[PDB]
Structure 1
Amino acid sequence: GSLTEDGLSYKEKFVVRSYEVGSNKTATVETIANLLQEVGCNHAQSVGFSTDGFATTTTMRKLHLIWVTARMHIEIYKYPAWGDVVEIETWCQSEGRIGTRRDWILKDSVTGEVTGRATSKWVMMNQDTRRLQKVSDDVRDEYLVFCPQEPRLAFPEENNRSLKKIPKLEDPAQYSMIGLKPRRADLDMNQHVNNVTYIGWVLESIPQEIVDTHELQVITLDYRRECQQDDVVDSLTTTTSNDSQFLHLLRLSGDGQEINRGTTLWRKK
């Protein structure tokens, strides 16, 4: 991987592995999500930021401040097959008082065609209290020299799907998968549940008949609270709709505290 010529974006190629593919012999959406985080980490490494997933500066580390994902939105047109080469380009931008954004474009290396795109919203928070706090000008200024100044959006449309408000699923859910819990492989280097694990958990409550006859086109996931290493999660889904759409909710098995909400859109094969 490498920074591009203008140094305002980062590109990396990946060859799809045998264990990375699903029943369609193409990369799963969780494999794609892992690759997005990977190219994000390599971008941070390339310009001197932390590589722990929080992409911090020395100033933020003295204050115990971190960047955390508030929303992930992925749209895939073609999943790459086993052995194919996928090229991923990523960039960041500041969105002032609202927080920050990281975007991605996925392309087939052989044809140069755009096979998918993704966007994510980030907020700043004290890692100990979990209280949000607005970025100071001195912290922000250190990042702006690595971002394009003119708007560069993977999702330019004014009322596009990536910004839609997601409602809260009401009981009873149409489908459920209960008692889900993370194992050590679901944790990162600092013992936090990897953001991709929550994608896998949302999808566990999709009926297998849908997975067998449809392909996932869009997933939007809001991140409200983290699931700790010793927590247990319930995954709930209700059909909201040749296309199928679902409303999703992840909550703690016991008291029902919400950790994530989302929506998915599937197209018939």
Structure 2
Amino acid sequence: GSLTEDGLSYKEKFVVRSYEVGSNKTATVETIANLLQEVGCNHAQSVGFSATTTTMRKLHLIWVTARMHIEIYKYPAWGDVVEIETWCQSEGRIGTRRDWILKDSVTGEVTGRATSKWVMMNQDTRRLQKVSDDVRDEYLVFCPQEPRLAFPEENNRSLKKIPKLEDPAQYSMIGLKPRRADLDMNQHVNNVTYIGWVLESIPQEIVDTHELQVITLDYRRECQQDDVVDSLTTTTSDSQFLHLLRLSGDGQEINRGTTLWRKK
């Protein structure tokens, strides 16, 4: 991969692997989400990050995902080459945004798009905060200054408010636990695992007859390595579902989300 000519975005090509695909021989949404993370990490490395900035390391601050929104038009098949372009933008004092565009390397057409909202947090107390001027200055140099949105449309699915699922849920998958492969290099549960857990409560018949077109996920709290999660789903409708991940015991919310599925 490499930064583009202006140095304000990053591109990388990936060849879809045999273990990365599902029953239709196309990449799962989790493989797509892993690739978005990888191109994001490669972009941060290319522009000098060790994405904590110098000031963030001094004030013990980290970026945490608040929301992830993905829309897939075509899932790349096993052996296909997908090109992903990524960029970040400052959202004033609120936080930052990272966007992605997925393209078929052979045809050049857009096969998917994603957007994510990140907020600042003290890594020890876990308390959220706004973005200060000193931190905004050291990352503005890597962002386009004029707006560049993967989801430009005025009133699109990426900015919709998600309600809290009420008991009883129509479907559920209980007792979900992360294993070591679900952890990142800092021993935290990878954000992609939560996408997997959300999908676990969708019945197999829907998965077998539909393709996931849109997924919006809100992140409220982290699941620790010794935590146990319940995944809850209710049909709200194409089929649309409302989702909720909560701790098995006290019922503490960890995530909420929505999915939109198209008939094959």
Q: CA deviation at 1:133?
A: 1.1
Tell me if structure 1 keeps the 8 A contact 2:86–2:98. Answer: yes
Instruction: Say if 2:84 and 2:100, in contact at 8 Å, map to a contact too.
Output: yes
Shift of 1:97: 2.3
Q: CA deviation at 1:56?
A: 0.3
Which of 172, 180, 183 is the aligned partner of 1:184?
180
Correspondence 1:1-269 to 2 at 5 A:
1-50=1-50, 55-241=51-237, 243-269=238-264
Residues 170-217 of structure 1: per-residue CA shift (max 9 Å, x gap): 000000000000000000011000000000000000000000000000
* CA-based RMSD: 0.5
Which deviations, in whole Å up to 9, do the C-alpha atoms of 1:39-78 show, x marking residues without a partner? 000000001113xxxx101221121100000000000000
Deviations 1:91-115 (A, max 9, x none): 0000112211000000000000000
Separation (CA, whole Å) in 2 of partners of 1:115 and 1:66: 31
Alpha-carbon offset, residue 139 of structure 1: 1.0
Which shifted more, 26-35 or 55-64?
A: 55-64
Deviation at 1:79, TM superposition (A): 0.1
Equivalent position SS for 1:201: helix
**Aligned residues with identical type, % of pairs:** 100
Distance 1:168 1:191 in 2: 29
SS at match of 1:96: coil
Q: How far is the alpha carbon of 1:163 from its aligned partner?
A: 0.1
For residues 238-269 of structure 1, give each alpha carbon's deviation from its aligned partner in whole angstroms, at most 9, with x where no partner exists: 0000x000000000000000000000000000
- CA separation in 1, counterparts of 2:191 and 2:48? 23
Question: How far apart, CA to CA, are the structure 1 residues paired with 2:54 and 2:225?
Answer: 27
Deviation of 1:12 after TM superposition, in Å, equals: 0.1
Secondary structure of 2:126's aligned partner: coil
Distance (whole Å) between structure 2 residues aligned to residue 144 and residue 57 of structure 1: 11
Gaps in structure 2 of 5+ consecutive residues: none
Separation in structure 1 between the aligned mates of residue 134 and residue 259 of structure 2, nearest angstrom: 39
CA contact (8 A) 2:93 2:132 kept: no
Q: What is the CA-CA distance between 1:89 and the residue it aligns to?
A: 0.1
Could you tell me how far apart the structure 1 residues matched to 2:39 and 2:211 are?
Answer: 24
1:38 to partner: Cα distance: 0.2
Matches of 1:98 and 1:116, distance apart in 2? 26
**134-143 or 75-84: bigger deviation:** 134-143
Runs of 4+ in 1 over 2 A off after TM superposition: none
Which secondary structure does the structure 1 equivalent of 2:184 belong to? Answer: coil
91-100 or 258-267, larger mean C-alpha shift: 91-100
- In the alignment, the residues of structure 2 paired with residue 180 and residue 75 of structure 1 have an alpha-carbon distance, to the nearest angstrom, of 26
User: How far apart are the structure 1 equivalents of 2:63 and 2:94?
Assistant: 13
CA distance in 2, matches of 1:158, 1:128: 38
Query: Matched residues in 1 for 2:125 and 2:202: separation?
Result: 34
Q: Distance in 2 between matches of 1:113 and 1:46?
A: 26
In structure 1, how many angstroms separate the alpha carbons of the residues matched to 2:54 and 2:148?
27
| Deviations 1:108-142, CA, capped at 9 Å, x for gaps | 00000000000000000001111011121111101
When the two structures are aligned, how many residues end up with a matched partner?
264
When normalised by structure 1's length, the TM-score is 0.97
SS in 2 for 1:121: strand
The alpha-carbon deviation at position 235 of structure 1 amounts to 0.1
